[PDB]
Fold this sequence. Notes:
Assembly: monomeric
Shape: globular
Number of helices: 1
Entry title: Solution NMR structure of DnaX mini intein from Spirulina platensis
Order of helices and strands: EEEHEEEEEEEEEE
Helix content: under 10%
Number of strands: 13
PDB class: splicing
Largest sheet: 5 strands, antiparallel
Number of domains: 1
Keywords: Spl DnaX, Intein, Protein splicing, splicing
Distance between the termini: 5 Å
Strand content: over 45%
Structural class: mainly beta
Name: Spl DnaX mini-intein
Amino acid sequence: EALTGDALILSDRGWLRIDDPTLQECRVLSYNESTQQWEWQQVLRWLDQGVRETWKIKTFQTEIKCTGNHLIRTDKGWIKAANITPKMKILSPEIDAAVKTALQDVESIEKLGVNHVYDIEVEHNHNFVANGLLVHN
């Protein structure tokens, strides 16, 4: 739902800060429920969120801090971020000759508290991947 200012989100170019040109002007990586595969969706509009508490979900492949109450995609499907535990795994995209899905293991979630938050909306799948972690929006 919301990502901290120092957070990074996948875009057409790749991993960049939540307030990068590619996130705000180029397509981003999402899990297309319709085609059951990774696809790029257009970033509708960059939105700020200012002061908001955040939880840092840490995984072996990546780590990021968001609202912590919004549901995010996991191996089993969408799950409340607060509910996520180290055991939980999240499917992430792999860039190469062909896009491939790979699960990452959650190390733990660490509270970051009140932070500056920013995020952008998407068109078709209504979802996007922040720092390799799929988040509903």
